[PDB]
């Protein structure tokens, strides 16, 4: 009873929040799924929901700033959390969800379903509400808007290294054109706007150890972001004339074996995937 129950409320689940970039935007949309299940005798539930779920995300696809990111979901080294099960999927990463959020309102469901959840396109066309080849083609102008397993090695040599201020290290591991791109919607010192570019980027995060001081790693705590290893903060209060840091969370993105982009997000209403909430 509750185990097929499950499965198909985390399907319910993953498909739900890629299909915006919210927890709290699936956990909305998978609210009316259960309502809208009614009829039955001779069913496919599974299959009846997505729909259900998939044209409610449609729906959905105060602010007063800019630059918008995702909302990311925070589990545990264990992964047993209940929302874990939503971003096991690798092309759940912070990175792939970026890409998918503030650029693709349109291209989203025919790729998500299909690249992502192997929908077919018949499936697809039927939420979509045209032609067989009509989703694939507004699948394939998603694929075309694109343009490691070192992650642990990779982010744990980062997490302890930097507090040795070790900056030669530092400058390698980072892409020429590596980003920060920090969500500005919450009232928090961010990047704002999006800096760009290796010698740039750590300046900015020079700024921050330099704003923060060192008690910074303390309350770092090491958690999986978006199914890969990250980390998130509980903020810091600055006692030696520092500024009071505010808790947030910070995706590490990897290829090449360097560090290609890292994910500031600071705002409080974008914490419905974290142990801080």
């Known amino acids: 009873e509750v185990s097929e129950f499950e499965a198909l409320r985390q399907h319910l689940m993953s498909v739900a929040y890629r299909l915006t970039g919210t927890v709290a935007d699936a956990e909305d949309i998978v609210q009316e799924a259960w309502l809208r299940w009614d009829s039955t005798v001779i069913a496919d539930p599974r299959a009846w929901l997505t729909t259900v779920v998939s044209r409610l995300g449609l729906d959905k696809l105060e602010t007063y700033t800019g630059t918008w990111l995702p909302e990311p979901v925070v589990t545990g080294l264990d992964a047993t959390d209940p929302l874990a099960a939503v971003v096991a999927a690798e092309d759940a990463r912070f990175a792939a969800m970026v890409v998918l959020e503030r650029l693709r309102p349109d291209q989203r469901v025919a790729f998500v379903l299909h690249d992502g ?49 070790d900056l030669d290290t530092v400058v390698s591991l980072l892409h020429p054109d590596v980003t920060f791109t920090g969500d500005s919607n919450g009232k928090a010192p961010t990047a704002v706007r999006a800096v760009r570019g290796s010698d740039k980027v750590v300046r900015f995060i020079l700024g921050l150890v330099q ?33 009071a840091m505010a808790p947030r969370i910070t995706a590490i993105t990897v290829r090449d074996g360097k560090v290609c982009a890292l994910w500031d997000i600071a705002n409080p209403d974008k914490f419905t995937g974290s142990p801080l909430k």
């Open 117 to 165: 959840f192997a929908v077919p396109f018949a499936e697809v066309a039927e939420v979509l509400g045209t032609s067989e080849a009509a989703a694939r083609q507004l699948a394939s102008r998603a694929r075309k808007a694109v343009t490691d397993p070192a992650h642990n090695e990779v982010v744990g040599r980062l997490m302890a290294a930097m507090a040795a201020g």
């Open 211 to 243: 704003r923060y001081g060192p008690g910074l790693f303390g309350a770092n705590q090491l958690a999986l972001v978006n199914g890969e290893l990250g980390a998130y903060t509980a903020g810091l209060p600055g006692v030696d004339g520092y500024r």
